[PDB]
Design an enzyme around this catalytic site. Structure first.
Site, PDB file in Angstrom:
ATOM      1  N   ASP A 137       0.826  -1.206   0.000  1.00 22.10           N
ATOM      2  CA  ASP A 137       0.000   0.000   0.000  1.00 22.10           C
ATOM      3  C   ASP A 137       0.863   1.260   0.000  1.00 22.10           C
ATOM      4  O   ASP A 137       0.710   2.149   0.840  1.00 22.10           O
ATOM      5  CB  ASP A 137      -0.974  -0.001   1.181  1.00 22.10           C
ATOM      6  CG  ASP A 137      -1.743  -1.299   1.293  1.00 22.10           C
ATOM      7  OD1 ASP A 137      -1.180  -2.284   1.815  1.00 22.10           O
ATOM      8  OD2 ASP A 137      -2.907  -1.339   0.845  1.00 22.10           O
ATOM      9  N   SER A 138       1.791   1.317  -0.951  1.00 20.65           N
ATOM     10  CA  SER A 138       2.571   2.504  -1.265  1.00 20.65           C
ATOM     11  C   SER A 138       2.343   2.865  -2.728  1.00 20.65           C
ATOM     12  O   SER A 138       1.700   2.126  -3.478  1.00 20.65           O
ATOM     13  CB  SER A 138       4.060   2.281  -0.974  1.00 20.65           C
ATOM     14  OG  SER A 138       4.865   3.228  -1.651  1.00 20.65           O
TER      15      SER A 138
END
Ligand SMILES: [Mg+2]
Ligand SMILES: [Zn+2]
Ligand SMILES: [Zn+2]
Ligand SMILES: [Zn+2]
Lengths: 526, 77, 240, 65, 98, 98, 255, 35, 44, 115, 192
Positions: A205-206
């Site tokens: 989740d970057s």
RNA sequence: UUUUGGCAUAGUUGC
């Protein structure tokens, strides 16, 4: 019901509820009850006729209003208690229509299902294609976005404010937004996103952003702080006064520069200042004088944007000072979709380093594919596809939740009309070698929101700074400085490790080393 | 007849390396010939592999008594 | 009251004996970085420039620590304090006097943290031994902590916006202690359920699943470019 | 608020076309036809004029101070 | 003169009531600012809608952890009077008597 | 000064009765986005109260259809308690029964 | 054991963009050429900006950022110009910089548009490329905007404002003969403008012994430079970089 | 006379637009304070 | 120093010991004049 | 605040050499060329050109970290050939190719202008 | 390092096309759904006619609830297996689930074919209104959608009633996380 | 020529 629909004796917020099983009629005209409008249905037919809609279309230069629809008894307010005694229709186009009848007695019909959504949840495009925890996450995060929160923000002087340089109305939008006024005060940017794995800075989740786009002002924002201070003549023992101090007149002072201020003890706007500077030169007379001037929060720099001077409620001269500080997107800044896909900026790459399509289009953002399967934000993918279709078609798409006429099949056909893969997958070339990436890549515009959390706003260290006055431990004051909670769980973790000397250092030497003389016959401190 | 194990526990390794590294940092003599090293940690590790650290471990048995061990006597693993 | 000063977590016992604020620590957001070994942690320049370690002056490092003292707080790497054996603290941002900077063995310089130093990386809450682990400093020129993608699952931290803490040991004793007890390689196997605590993660795991398929074939140049990244490569290209 | 100078993705100039986009909209061009008339083919640039809100008009209503 | 009452913004006694957007721009007020809040000490304070149980309404519940099998309660309160809301409970005991 | 106090600090009730006077009514207006300001304007809070421990209000009940957003609440320990109105929701202002 | 002999074919030539084909070349050379197109074709952009006075609704650095992205016609002047940090001057001089001045005083109730037309160079060889014109900022009655800027030599790698190309379309193997990509269902995919596959197939037969060739380029200029000038300066800059690297390597080996 | 299915999809949103033009989004607070 | 009245834009100087008031409007909000120090911007 | 000076992403600061050579000890005839303030633009093209030469047994390059600007090129040739010789020949071949390409591109521009 | 540097050459994604099955697959799924709906109608009318006989140690409501529950369960499982059969080799969902790096087979069955039955406390959606889960249904209804069985997939899109019932279902998970963060580690804080 | 400095309940926000 006749009189309420005619508004003769009964205002249209009084609810009447008939419980047949108990032989009771309860009538409530008190405050605090909650109701909503509902269209009235009789003989399995709407009382709303096309002439009413024609009268609504000419609202201006006609003076026909919603209150006429209330007056004509076509739409009536119904409360949650009275809803129990209602056989409600979702949509008139199928449910009241003759069929193998599920029910043959519908009293009311809803105006539109999408009105069940909230004010900050209504902005979600395709909310019925996402796991509802993602809808709650987006509802929470949309309040945290950056944007033009109000038009007159220039005149206002608020504590903290954020303004995005180039907002955009979303390419894919629900019709409800037209009444939010969010179309006129947007918060976020439509950005080309490519959902694909890369060098490995997008994972967990970057997101990986185009450095070149940021250099073109992409997601650049401004953060406004405002400080304030008043003087006063409290009794006769003291009198604080706005004036720049000097060591030769103030016999107690802090080591810093003071030449930025003017003779009034205030800084002129347009001066670029660091966190340790002085913004309000103000000092109190000892019963010579001593400084109690106002410094900036010692974690930042900025420009004193606007200095206002006025009188308080008492009449004492007090001043507010709004300080501007530009914020460029950088590594760690938090971005979110309209579907809960929150992620921090993992790394920035220039345009040539970034991947790209056959047309030279490069993605503004790249997100990990693995954010999708567990979360199941399929509304995100459909939003990207519909955004691509709208941008190629040159017409703002629709994102009403339960609009049956729109589905991914028709969107795919419309996309195929423009010479693209019907599912949005595209061949992309690696920027480092120019080779065709083996698997094809899903790409298109998507609305992303810069949340108000930046790394410089939340970062600090502790290097033997201003300790407490009660325990000599580090304290939270003047800044985020003050160390970190070495909580009991951390102690227990070190017991598990057995790092006894490290625990000793963290708890005793590195926090508050002290020593005391004690008698060897009694435990009394010498 | 030292009844305890002839092995060096990881905690004993940590303490002896840390203490000898601090000793070397305090300009102590080095009981092994260094080879251009500057970090006391690496020099202490070299001495441990050489089994040439003058520290004596004192393991306190739970009954109040104790055993004493040379570092070279223990099995370094 | 006196009783109120001690009860609860916020009293003196639970609030200021079993846990407390501590000097020489920092906290910030994390971001992924696959180019770092699992035992290495990337740190911003500002924190390392501010946070410091005490190095004792010896005849080996006298030149290096002398140069660090010469640089001072202004540049990175540098130093903040000279602590002579007398206990006097010469602060290296206010005294540009060479009489104050003359060094000798026994002094202790408060030099800025640099690459290869040891830190304890931590996260609220701590639920097991791997929730606090020893990492090796790496200066990177941006404003967030980094982590290898594999050390995320022991810490339970994703890069959504949750922050993590960094505690800098100060003495060589505890530095060796963290080196030989709490480093990430020593913590790979948990004693909880006698298994590895970390493994291979999202993009790497899907990519290796696709990679080890039977029908993957690679050209000469692709193979040579991939063999560059193998640190433990012998240097001999195997027969295709 | 104001139109960006360039498209963020590709970098084509767009700051000399928002007023022309409005003017062609007053000619009752379909928005796609208007963007085609202004030589915006890649949807990266079309996003700009299709999704931009020019709040500067609402900001100039206040006093110049 | 007995006191001063805060005025909700854009309410029927607010100066911004019924004005046109241009006049609001003369006053440096955003036409899209919805109001519906108060200004106290300059700070914008807004009231949150407080949910509570309705009044004058008989409700029959079951206090399982009571000597009563059931309980019929009513929070009786006058209209615009007697802010003390008298709550009555009439409860049937269980048959676990002595 | 009484009303000014009760809006200034969020305490609601007499100032000396702050021991048991319910607080958390008047809050600083959320000015970060227009949507955030709107969501704070329409917010409704359920107190914990003695009734919250008999019936669990955190769960979304079916009667909140069309009156309260199904998915809009602060994620934390206040899940379900703090809610926001549905778009077409309108709250009765009260009238006389005469 | 030597580099290929590339052949060029310019398919389309226009003053805003150009489209050509390079044949008999390696993939890496083509990728580096497009990287040099975006990154290392230097142009002149307004960088340094002194605000003598601002009264617009928009803060100063917003205006400076907007002035940065204004393209400038630097076809010939950029060669004789030099980098400011390399040249020997106090702050600025014609050998490494170009001065601009701007001053607009709106005292008319009608809306004012401070556009790129209002920029005033001290040399006519460099002007805004539009000189409709680019809007910089709208002004009201009572609002002034006065400033003086300087434009200097730079390239896109340092900052995107010096990026001369508005997007570089690239292609190779349009029929996917090499099968560098794997279409799960080739029937669904559109044909490129260069693909020769008729409309009954979707992939050329897989050539095992093939190699990348016939690299198609469509370089779109922002108009700061002519497209042919962009490509020529790109090749010149890459040759300059490689010659400098050869010089440094020779010095290293001799040392 | 009655609304056809094809026309309902825009008629309902015209009705909602008239509603929000009449009442607005903060009707609750304003009406309660006026009362 | 010099301050601008917040309503009618009346430039006026105010001493260090007199309450502020517009010299032609009576208004009681004043804004500082722009700094006369050199300010520069890199356009990045 | 820790954003790097971007202009020091391609400029050798003082005390920095453009390129250095390190003879790897694992395999004979193996050298590592570490070049500072460079990126894939030179690395990829030089890698391909070195791969063209049949006398080069192995040639590759990497970037140890994208934020940094080192590139490390490993070159291994036959035991009758210097890796530095291979590097210099590759650079000369690339420069000759680009000069030829410039000449042909000018000719093509003139042809399209007259045509 | 080596796997990421190879993944640059390979590349990995997830797209709308990865969430598409055959028209035959959708048709088979719809046939199974109509079969399950008709079967639940059969059980409902049997219970209505007093023709459903309760199992031992269970009341009639428990017997009916277990029957309809297992009917919906095996219908969901059959639809999920059919969806799993329709997946390609290049489907990125199958790439991410077979690798086990993210997601599961249940997630694929949810996105492509059937989101499935929602639950509160381990039961179907309760009658918040008197004998009704929502006003849009008739009194004394125990059908799948009436008691909160989502029949569409996420890609197909939820209906308003199904959307609200799924919101109710997810609210339970959010409450679970909240009470987790409340009570987590207090056990541990006493144990240590 | 050397810098300091508050405690509190309430509120919101972030894994
Ligand atoms: Mg997290
Ligand atoms: Zn574009
Ligand atoms: Zn010069
Ligand atoms: Zn005035």
């Amino acid at each position: 019901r006749k009189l309420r629909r005619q508004m003769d004796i009964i205002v249209s917020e009084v609810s009447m509820i008939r419980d047949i099983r108990e032989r009771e009629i309860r009538i409530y005209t008190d405050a605090g009850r909650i109701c909503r409008p509902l269209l009235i249905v009789e003989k399995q037919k709407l009382l709303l006729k096309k002439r009413h809609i024609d009268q609504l279309k000419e609202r201006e230069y006609n003076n026909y209003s919603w209150q006429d629809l209330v007056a004509s008894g076509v739409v009536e307010y119904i409360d949650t208690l009275e809803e129990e005694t209602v056989m409600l229709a979702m949509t008139p186009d199928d449910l009241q229509e003759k069929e193998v009848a599920y029910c043959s007695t519908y009293t009311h019909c809803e105006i539109h299902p999408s009105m069940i959504l909230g004010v900050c949840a209504s902005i979600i495009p395709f909310p019925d294609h996402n796991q509802s925890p993602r809808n709650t996450y987006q509802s929470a995060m949309g309040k945290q976005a950056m944007g033009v929160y109000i038009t007159n923000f220039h005149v206002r002087m608020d504590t903290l404010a954020h303004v995005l340089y180039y907002p955009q109305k979303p390419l894919v939008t629900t019709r409800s937004m037209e009444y939010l006024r969010f179309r006129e005060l947007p918060a976020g940017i439509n950005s080309i996103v490519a959902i694909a794995s890369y060098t490995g800075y997008n994972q967990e989740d970057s997101v990986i952003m185009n450095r070149s786009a940021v250099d073109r002002g992409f997601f650049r924002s401004v953060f406004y702080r405002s400080y304030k201070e008043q003087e006063s003549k409290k009794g006769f023992d003291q009198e604080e006064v706005f004036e720049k101090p000097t060591r030769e007149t103030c016999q107690g002072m802090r080591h810093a520069i003071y030449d930025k201020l003017d003779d009034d003890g205030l800084i002129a706007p347009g001066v670029r200042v660091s966190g340790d500077d002085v913004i309000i030169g103000k000092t109190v007379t000892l019963p010579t004088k001593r400084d109690c001037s106002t410094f900036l929060r010692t974690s930042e720099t900025g420009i004193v944007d606007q200095v206002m001077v006025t009188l308080n409620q008492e009449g004492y001269k007090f001043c507010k000072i709004r300080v501007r500080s530009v914020r460029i997107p950088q590594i760690g800044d938090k971005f979110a979709s309209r579907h809960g896909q929150k992620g921090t900026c993992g790394i920035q790459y220039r345009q040539e380093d970034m991947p790209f399509t056959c047309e030279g289009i490069t993605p503004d953002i790249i997100i990990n594919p693995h954010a999708i399967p567990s979360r199941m934000t399929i509304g995100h993918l459909i939003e990207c596809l519909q955004g691509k279709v709208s941008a190629n078609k040159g017409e703002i798409g629709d994102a009403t939740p339960f609009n049956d006429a729109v589905n991914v099949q028709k969107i795919s056909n419309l996309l195929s009309d423009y010479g693209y893969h019907l599912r949005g997958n595209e061949v992309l070339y690696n920027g480092f070698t120019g080779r065709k990436i083996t698997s094809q890549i899903f790409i298109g515009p998507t609305y992303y929101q810069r949340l108000k959390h930046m790394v410089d706003d939340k970062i600090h260290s502790r290097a033997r700074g201003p300790i407490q006055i009660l325990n000599r431990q580090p304290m939270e004051g003047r800044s985020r400085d003050g160390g970190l909670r070495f909580g009991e769980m951390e102690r227990d973790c070190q017991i598990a490790h057995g790092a006894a000397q490290f625990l000793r250092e963290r708890l005793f030497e590195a926090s508050d080393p002290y020593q005391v003389h004690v008698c060897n016959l009694c435990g009394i401190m010498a | 007849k030292r009844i305890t194990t002839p092995y060096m526990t990881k905690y004993e390794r940590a303490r002896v390396l840390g203490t000898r590294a601090l000793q070397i940092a305090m300009c102590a003599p080095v009981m092994v010939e260094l080879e251009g090293e500057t970090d006391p940690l690496l020099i202490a590790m070299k001495e441990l592999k050489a089994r040439k650290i003058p520290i004596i471990i004192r393991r306190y048995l739970p009954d109040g008594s104790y055993e004493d061990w040379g570092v070279d006597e223990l099995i370094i693993s | 009251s006196l009783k109120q000063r001690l009860k609860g977590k916020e009293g003196r016992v639970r609030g200021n004996l079993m846990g407390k604020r501590v000097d020489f620590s920092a906290r910030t957001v994390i971001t992924p970085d696959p180019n770092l070994s699992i035992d290495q942690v990337g740190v911003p320049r500002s924190i390392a420039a501010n946070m410091t370690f005490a190095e004792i002056v010896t005849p080996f490092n006298i030149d290096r620590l002398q140069e660090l003292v010469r640089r001072g707080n202004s540049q990175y790497p540098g130093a903040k304090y000279i602590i002579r054996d007398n206990g006097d603290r010469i602060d290296l941002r206010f005294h540009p006097k060479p009489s104050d900077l003359h060094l000798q063995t026994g002094y202790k310089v408060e030099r800025h943290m640099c690459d290869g130093d040891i830190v304890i990386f931590n996260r609220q809450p701590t639920l097991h031994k791997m929730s606090m682990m020893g990492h090796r400093v790496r200066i990177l020129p941006w404003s967030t902590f980094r982590l290898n993608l594999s050390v995320t699952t022991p810490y339970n931290a994703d890069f959504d916006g949750d922050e993590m803490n960094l505690h800098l040991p100060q003495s060589l004793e505890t530095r060796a202690e963290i080196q030989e007890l709490a480093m990430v390689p020593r913590m790979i196997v948990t004693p909880q359920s006698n298994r590895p605590v970390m493994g291979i993660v999202q993009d790497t795991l899907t990519a290796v699943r696709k990679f080890t398929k039977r029908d993957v074939f690679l050209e000469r140049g692709e193979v040579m470019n991939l063999l560059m990244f193998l640190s433990t490569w012998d240097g001999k290209v195997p027969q295709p | 608020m104001i139109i960006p100078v360039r498209c963020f993705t590709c970098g084509k100039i767009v700051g000399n076309k928002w007023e022309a986009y409005l003017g062609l909209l007053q000619a009752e061009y379909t928005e796609g036809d208007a963007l085609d008339a202004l030589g915006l083919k890649r949807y990266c640039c079309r996003r700009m004029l299709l999704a931009h809100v020019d709040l500067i008009e609402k900001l100039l209503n206040y006093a110049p101070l | 003169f007995i006191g001063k009452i805060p005025i909700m913004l854009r309410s029927t006694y607010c100066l911004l009531n019924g004005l046109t957007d241009r006049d609001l721009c003369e006053l440096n007020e955003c036409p899209l600012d919805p109001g519906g809040y108060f200004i106290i000490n300059g700070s914008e304070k807004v009231l949150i809608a407080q949910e509570k149980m309705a009044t004058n309404t008989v409700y029959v519940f079951a206090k399982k952890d009571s000597k009563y099998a059931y309980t019929g309660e009513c929070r009786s309160c006058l209209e615009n009077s007697s802010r003390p809301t008298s709550t009555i409970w009439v409860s049937m005991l269980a048959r676990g008597g002595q | 000064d009484g009303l000014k106090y009760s809006l200034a600090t969020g305490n609601w009730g007499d100032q000396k009765k702050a021991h048991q006077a319910r607080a958390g009514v008047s809050q600083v207006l959320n000015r970060l986005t227009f949507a955030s300001t709107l969501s704070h304007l329409r917010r409704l809070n359920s107190p914990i109260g003695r009734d919250g421990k008999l019936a669990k209000p955190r769960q979304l009940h079916n009667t909140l259809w069309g009156m309260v957003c199904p998915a809009e609440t602060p994620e934390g320990h206040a899940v379900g308690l703090v809610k926001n109105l549905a778009l077409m929701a309108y709250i009765s202002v009260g009238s006389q029964p005469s | 054991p030597y580099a290929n002999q590339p052949t060029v074919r310019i398919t389309e030539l226009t003053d805003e963009n150009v489209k050509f084909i390079i044949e008999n070349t390696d993939l890496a050379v083509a990728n580096s050429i497009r990287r040099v197109f975006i990154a290392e074709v230097p142009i002149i952009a307004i960088d340094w900006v002194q605000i003598d006075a601002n009264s617009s609704v928009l803060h100063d650095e917003f205006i400076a950022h907007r002035l940065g992205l204004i393209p400038l016609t630097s076809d010939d002047i950029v060669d004789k110009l030099q980098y400011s940090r390399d040249c020997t001057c106090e702050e600025f001089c014609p050998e490494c910089s170009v001065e601009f001045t701007l001053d607009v005083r709106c005292n008319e109730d009608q809306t004012r548009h401070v556009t790129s037309r209002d920029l005033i160079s001290n040399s006519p060889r460099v002007i805004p490329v539009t000189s409709d014109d680019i809007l910089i900022v709208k002004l009201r009655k009572g609002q002034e905007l006065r400033l003086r800027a300087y434009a200097k030599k730079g390239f896109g790698k340092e900052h995107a404002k010096w990026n001369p190309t508005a997007g570089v379309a690239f292609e190779y193997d349009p029929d996917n003969a090499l099968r560098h990509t794997v279409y799960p269902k080739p029937e669904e995919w559109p044909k490129s403008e260069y693909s020769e596959l008729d409309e009954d197939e979707s992939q050329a037969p897989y050539d095992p012994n093939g190699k990348p060739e016939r690299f198609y380029y469509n370089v779109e200029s922002c108009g700061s430079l002519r497209p042919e000038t962009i490509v020529l300066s790109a090749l010149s800059g890459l040759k300059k970089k490689l010659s400098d690297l050869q010089t440094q390597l020779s010095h290293e080996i001799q040392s | 006379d009655e609304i056809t299915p094809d026309l309902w999809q825009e008629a309902c949103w015209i009705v909602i637009s008239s509603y929000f033009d009449e009442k607005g989004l903060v009707r609750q607070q304003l009406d309660s304070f006026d009362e | 120093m010099i301050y601008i009245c917040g309503e009618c834009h009346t430039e006026n100087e105010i001493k260090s010991r007199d309450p502020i008031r517009c010299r032609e409007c009576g208004y009681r909000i004043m804004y500082k004049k722009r700094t006369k120090r050199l300010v520069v911007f890199d356009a990045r | 605040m820790n954003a790097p000076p971007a202009f020091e992403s391609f400029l050798l600061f003082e005390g920095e050499k453009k390129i250095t050579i390190n003879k790897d000890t694992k395999v004979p005839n193996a050298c590592l060329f570490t070049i500072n303030k460079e990126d894939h633009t030179l690395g990829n093209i030089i890698k391909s050109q070195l791969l063209k030469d049949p006398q080069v047994l192995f040639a590759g390059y990497k970037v140890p970290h994208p934020l940094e600007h080192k590139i490390i090129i490993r070159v291994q040739t036959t035991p009758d050939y210097s890796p530095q010789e291979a590097f210099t020949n590759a650079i000369t071949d690339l420069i000759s190719e680009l000069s030829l390409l410039e000449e042909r591109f000018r000719v093509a521009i003139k042809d399209k202008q007259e045509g | 390092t080596v796997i990421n540097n190879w993944l640059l050459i390979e590349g990995h994604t997830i797209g709308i096309g990865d969430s598409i099955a055959d028209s035959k697959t959708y048709q088979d799924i719809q046939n199974t759904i109509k079969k399950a709906k008709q079967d639940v109608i059969e059980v409902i009318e049997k219970a209505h006619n007093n023709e459903l006989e309760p199992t031992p140690g269970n009341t009639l409501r428990q017997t009916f609830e277990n029957q309809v529950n297992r009917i919906l369960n095996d219908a969901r499982d059959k639809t999920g297996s059919s969806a799993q059969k329709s997946l390609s080799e290049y489907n990125n969902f199958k790439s991410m689930v077979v690798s086990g790096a993210k997601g599961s087979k249940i997630n694929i069955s949810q996105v492509i074919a059937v989101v499935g039955q929602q639950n509160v406390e381990g039961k179907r959606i309760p009658f918040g209104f008197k004998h009704r889960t929502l006003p849009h249904f008739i009194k004394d209804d125990y059908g799948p959608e009436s008691r909160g069985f989502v029949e569409n997939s996420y890609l197909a899109g939820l209906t308003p009633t199904e959307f609200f019932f799924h919101a109710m279902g997810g609210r339970e998970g959010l409450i679970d996380t909240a009470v987790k963060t409340a009570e987590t580690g207090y056990i541990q804080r006493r144990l240590i």
